[PDB]
Design a protein around this ligand. Sequence first.
Ligand SMILES: [K+]
Ligand SMILES: [K+]
Ligand SMILES: [K+]
Ligand SMILES: [Mg+2]
Ligand SMILES: [Mg+2]
Ligand SMILES: [Mg+2]
Ligand SMILES: [Mg+2]
Ligand SMILES: [Mg+2]
Ligand SMILES: [Mg+2]
Ligand SMILES: [Mg+2]
Ligand SMILES: [Mg+2]
Ligand SMILES: [Mg+2]
Ligand SMILES: [Mg+2]
Ligand SMILES: [Mg+2]
Ligand SMILES: [Mg+2]
Lengths: 78, 252, 85, 202, 56
Amino acid sequence: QKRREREQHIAECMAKMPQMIVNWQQQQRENWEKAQADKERRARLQAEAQELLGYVDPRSARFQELLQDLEKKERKRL
Amino acid sequence: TPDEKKDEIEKIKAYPYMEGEPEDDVYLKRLYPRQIYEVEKAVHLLKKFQILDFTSPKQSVYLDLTLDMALGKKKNVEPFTSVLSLPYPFASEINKVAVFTENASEVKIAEENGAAFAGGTSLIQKIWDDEIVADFYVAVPEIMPELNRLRKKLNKKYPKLSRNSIGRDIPKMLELFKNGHEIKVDEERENFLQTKIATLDMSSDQIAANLQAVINEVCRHRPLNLGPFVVRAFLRSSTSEGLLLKIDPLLP
Amino acid sequence: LGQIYANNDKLSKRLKKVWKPQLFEREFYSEILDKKFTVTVTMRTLDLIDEAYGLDFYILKTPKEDLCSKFGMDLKRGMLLRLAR
Amino acid sequence: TVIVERWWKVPLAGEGRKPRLHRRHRVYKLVEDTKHRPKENLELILTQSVENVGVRGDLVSVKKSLGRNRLLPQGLAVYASPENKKLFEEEKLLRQEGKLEKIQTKAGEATVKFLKSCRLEVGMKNNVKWELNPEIVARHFFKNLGVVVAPHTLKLPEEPITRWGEYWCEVTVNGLDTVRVPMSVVNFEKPKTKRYKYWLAQ
Amino acid sequence: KSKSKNILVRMVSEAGTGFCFNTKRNRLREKLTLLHYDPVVKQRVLFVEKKKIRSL
RNA sequence: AAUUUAUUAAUGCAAACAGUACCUAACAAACCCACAGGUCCUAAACUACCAAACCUGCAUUAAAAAUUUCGGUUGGGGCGACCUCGGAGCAGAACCCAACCUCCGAGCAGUACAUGCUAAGACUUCACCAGUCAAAGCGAACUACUAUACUCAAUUGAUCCAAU
RNA sequence: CCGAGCCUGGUGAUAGCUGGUUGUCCAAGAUAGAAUCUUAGUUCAACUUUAAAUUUGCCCACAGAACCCUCUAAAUCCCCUU
RNA sequence: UAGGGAAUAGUUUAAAAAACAGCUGACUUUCAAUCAGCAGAUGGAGGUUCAAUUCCUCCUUCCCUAACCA
Ligand SMILES: [K+]
Ligand SMILES: [K+]
Ligand SMILES: [K+]
Ligand SMILES: [Mg+2]
Ligand SMILES: [Mg+2]
Ligand SMILES: [Mg+2]
Ligand SMILES: [Mg+2]
Ligand SMILES: [Mg+2]
Ligand SMILES: [Mg+2]
Ligand SMILES: [Mg+2]
Ligand SMILES: [Mg+2]
Ligand SMILES: [Mg+2]
Ligand SMILES: [Mg+2]
Ligand SMILES: [Mg+2]
Ligand SMILES: [Mg+2]
């Protein structure tokens, strides 16, 4: 009985695996495209702010907060 | 699980009880545990006492229920008021409800469903500037900002989402209130619930049905099988001592 | 009279330790001897007397190696001599 | 009693030989001290009557302190040995059927002693015309004195009582003892009013 | 002996075989999900971090 | 200094040993009732205190003691400094080579997630322990990212035991 | 001979430390290191001795063993023949 | 490390409020105080629900309690 249960558990878990990989691969691609978005936007905003004031916790915090609010304001509309 | 609250729950369970009269004809009550049980016999007995202790044929049966209103998890549930009409509503007439709705079609739905007091700013200002008494209040979400003025006045009796008294559909509490009878809660939160069931003249079967309805009504707050919700039940008339009902069969 | 390891750890110090029984002075009545005796006893002795249904049964039933008392053996001889005579 | 066990294994000695004990076998760990065990009750058969239990021949489970320091030394109880159980059991049969008279139960003796020294305040309302009958009077034992009286047992003065006054109720406890209690018919006062009026005031 | 910048974690196979391997990840980064060869099923399967063994 | 409280004193709990007490904040708004008070709009539920010592067991805190130790290198010892690992010179060309000799470093980080499995033949810090490199093969990868024992110099810790 | 008496016993205490260790004759026989509360000692290597097995040992011809860097050193390693 | 608990405005509390600080001012020689204003928050992520400080889940930080032996 123990052997049959372990084999059944593996079989069931391994029939789902092909779809799981598809989801995982897409998440990696999605994370690659999110990092690029972050790499771009954070740097520009933070860089400009630092150059103006002081040539940096306050400014970074503000930009790191307002951007979140903009996403939330869209989520509030949803 | 605070020691006092949980320990009392352990203690109240401990209180012994017995079936049937002891063999002895005359026995001191102290020498034997509580005995009288069956809900049918209990109602019949309460009628017997009414005759012996000359009193009104019709009296309020103020059933007090030691309902485990706590210990769902080690975190305890809280006191609410699940309002439902009994199968045969007793002859008491109660039609007191305040509805807050301003410049909305709900004003019509409020009065259409039998609201006693319906109004907006004018009604809110009356509550703050002058004394007025209603049993329960309801408000639509749009008026909650304005109603916040009466939060302090009502001392947490103002409508709250927790009691399902904030919502576009007012009839949650409004409609059912007149026929419905409120399951109020203890002030000391010792879990005993004083809830009238029936007038004494109501037939035993009708009172028995009225009892069962409350059993489901009270479990509504925590109808989980995780924690037993009922411990003891005392069916008392106004001018009589409480009798320990055998509520275990009727619990589920 | 024995030894113990401190904190029940064999790697710690070994200490001398004596466990003494709790002693009680109680009065008992012997039916065969029709006399009352004040004797120092333990709670075990009281339990054994209860299981024997009295002092006389306890004294007569209990073997010498279990009584562990010269006085107890003297009571046995007294009781047995009265029964024999 | 202290119960100990050895830390170190003792080598087997074999058949007909004594174990070889090294000085390491003197090291002991405390398994249990039996004085801390939950106390068990002592089963005794009563001889005379006691307030807690008093039916001669009743098998009672008492605290070992009570049985050993009071009941057994004084002769009020005996050990529940097979021999004693047989003797008391035989007596029970004779009481049920034979000449030996039936006796009150444990509760019956307690009630009789209470009923001997008690007065019943049968509060009756002024407004409604009332006639005192066994059933009504029986109710007042429960409310006032706390005694649960069967209606049939009560024997009233047999003179209809409709006026405040004093009378006598003859209570029969289990059919053997008849007690006559003083009866004080008084104007009924609700519990809250009576306690506030006098108990609080004085 | 230095600031703890990485941590050791146990990656557990999602095949239900129970085969596990230990990998090092940054403390601040999110839990690792990796495609790793599982000998029991003899093919690459998705693994998910379950526990943190120790701090590296 | 480490270890310890058996011992002694104090404290708590248990053990042992008596019983004592059982709990009161209305109010009629209407109506009844000569009063005194009642009907209605609750008149429920609920036991609480609790034995002084001596002795014994288990704990905690003190006192007073007990047992045991106080590393090495070193142009004498102490003081200072040093103690493991790697690169360079001394040691010019196979290997090896010292000084409290001369210099500079290490106690990681980063990328993989087949850093999977298995197996000829070898190297080796002068012993041992440990350490190092690997064909073929299985399974992968692959359609030319100097690709299948990652980059990196050192980047490190035996046995018992503990956790799982 | 009190930094803690004396006697007896455990006791032939233990001592990596010093001292001592008994007839004759012959033979082979000197010394890379590693670890160690270890450097006044040990264990493993190395050397040394005895017995046994079967096959090369020593001496060495060419050819051959790195750039970076200054003394472009005396030499070494490998090695048939003999 | 183990579980338990916790996370609210710059700060500290409450069931989305008050208090202080910042205060922009007014008034005090100066400064405090005082008065009136004004900014200000539900650790992070994901999900349920029309709506989540108020349901759940994982992670970070901190506390508690117990470890931290070899
Ligand atoms: K010198
Ligand atoms: K010498
Ligand atoms: K030495
Ligand atoms: Mg040391
Ligand atoms: Mg030295
Ligand atoms: Mg020196
Ligand atoms: Mg020094
Ligand atoms: Mg070697
Ligand atoms: Mg290959
Ligand atoms: Mg001398
Ligand atoms: Mg010697
Ligand atoms: Mg020679
Ligand atoms: Mg060492
Ligand atoms: Mg040496
Ligand atoms: Mg040669």
